[PDB]
């Protein structure tokens, strides 16, 4: 799976630098150059979404009480509802990735940096398996970068 490999690695990095509060400087293997500009446009957009929807995310967090890895893997059931309605857009996508990033921060405060791996795997599954032909149509992460680019 070419897109899942590209996606998972771009998602993981953003999750893990939000939980850290410090960026990873080593180079991307799979996504190559297309991931560099994606994470530099994920950091920018997802920090906007996380401030817009702190309240919303905090609310979903207190309801969906997260403690362990199986809580992290069963987030798939509610996370699909960002598309269970018909609408597919990059705003729904960065909201998916921004919430996962917000949860990765929460996981750190409860000392669960092990559970950031199957959160990243949970998010990419909901996103790649379900909305692939939308993603490929919309130029994948090349489009992700292009769509949110502002100048």
């Amino acid at each position, epitope marked *: 799976d070419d897109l899942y490999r590209q996606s998972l690695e771009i998602i993981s990095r953003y999750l893990r630098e939000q939980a850290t509060g410090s960026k990873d400087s080593k180079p991307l293997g799979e996504a190559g150059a297309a991931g560099r500009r994606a994470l530099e446009t994920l950091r920018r957009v997802g920090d906007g979404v996380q401030r817009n929807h702190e309240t919303a995310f905090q609310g979903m967090l207190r309801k969906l009480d997260i403690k362990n890895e199986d809580d992290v893997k069963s987030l798939s059931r509610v996370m699909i509802h960002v598309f269970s309605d018909g609408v597919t857009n990059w705003g729904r996508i960065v909201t998916l990735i921004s919430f996962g990033a917000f949860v990765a921060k929460h996981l750190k405060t409860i000392n669960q940096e092990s559970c950031i791996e199957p959160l990243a795997e949970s998010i990419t599954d909901v996103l790649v398996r379900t909305k692939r032909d939308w993603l490929v149509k919309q130029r994948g992460w090349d489009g992700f*970068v*292009e769509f949110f680019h502002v100048e």
Partner: antibody, heavy 119, light 110 residues
Framework: QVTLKESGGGLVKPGGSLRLSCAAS????????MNWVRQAPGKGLEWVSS????????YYADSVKGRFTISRDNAKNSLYLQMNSLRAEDTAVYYC????????????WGQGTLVTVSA | SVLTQPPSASGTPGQRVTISCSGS????????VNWYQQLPGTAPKLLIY???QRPSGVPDRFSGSKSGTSASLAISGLQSEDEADYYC???????????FGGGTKLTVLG
């Protein structure tokens, strides 16, 4: 100032090869899809090839498909098009056009570079 | 041409003008219609985007419409400097490729 400048076009024989060369200026070339649009003098515009920001999504028109290769070098702000085994019918002005990611509109264009396939 | 335009439309000054762009489920039916103006000598310059959104420097007298799998451009308020070829374009999901209309050479004759 936001400009596209196409170079390289000129006289090529039927069978010959030509590399059209677009230079992007005053924007972040590394964040746009690029497009080659060609226009036979007198006739309407034909799209010919597109290439996403980091060269991962490449698209060709049927006519040029096989004979033309699109590429870009985001270090040199340069888009390319290797026109191979050109036939008389490829005599066109080859424009270059930037793509708005949010609408896929070809917003900035270039002046165009005339290609002339003849003996 | 896959998108089909009239070869030549016209009107006298002041009038409404309509240039249609007959599409298809996989081009105009799925994606948007973008209009470009080509004056006498010039290169094309984005005239209308996402069906009916004008950029900076395109006046209120240029309107856009998408009607299922077709698309009118409306040049509501004709002027002798709208002598141009108007080209619609839509991305085609079936072709995985852009496709422009034949071109409509507008003219003023009053």
């Amino acid at each position: 100032q936001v400009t596209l400048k196409e170079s390289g076009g000129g006289l090529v024989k039927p069978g010959g090869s030509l590399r059209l060369s677009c230079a992007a200026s005053g924007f972040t070339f590394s964040s746009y899809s690029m497009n080659w649009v060609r226009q036979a003098p007198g006739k309407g515009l034909e799209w010919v090839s597109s290439i996403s920001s980091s060269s991962s999504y490449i698209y060709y028109a049927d006519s040029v498909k096989g004979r033309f290769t699109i590429s870009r070098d985001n270090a040199k702000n340069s888009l390319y098009l290797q026109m191979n085994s050109l036939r008389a019918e490829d005599t066109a002005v080859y424009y270059c056009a930037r793509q708005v990611g949010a609408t896929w509109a070809f917003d900035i264009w270039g002046q165009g570079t005339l290609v002339t396939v003849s003996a | 041409s896959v998108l089909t335009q009239p070869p030549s439309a016209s009107g006298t000054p002041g009038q409404r003008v309509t240039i249609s762009c007959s599409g298809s489920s996989s081009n105009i039916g799925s994606n948007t219609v973008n209009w470009y103006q080509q004056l006498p000598g010039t290169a094309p310059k984005l005239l209308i985007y996402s069906n009916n959104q004008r950029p900076s420097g395109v006046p209120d007298r240029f309107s856009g419409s998408k009607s299922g799998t077709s698309a009118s451009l409306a040049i509501s308020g004709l002027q002798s400097e709208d002598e141009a070829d108007y080209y619609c374009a839509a991305w085609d999901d079936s072709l995985n490729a852009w496709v422009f209309g034949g071109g409509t050479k507008l003219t003023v004759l009053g």
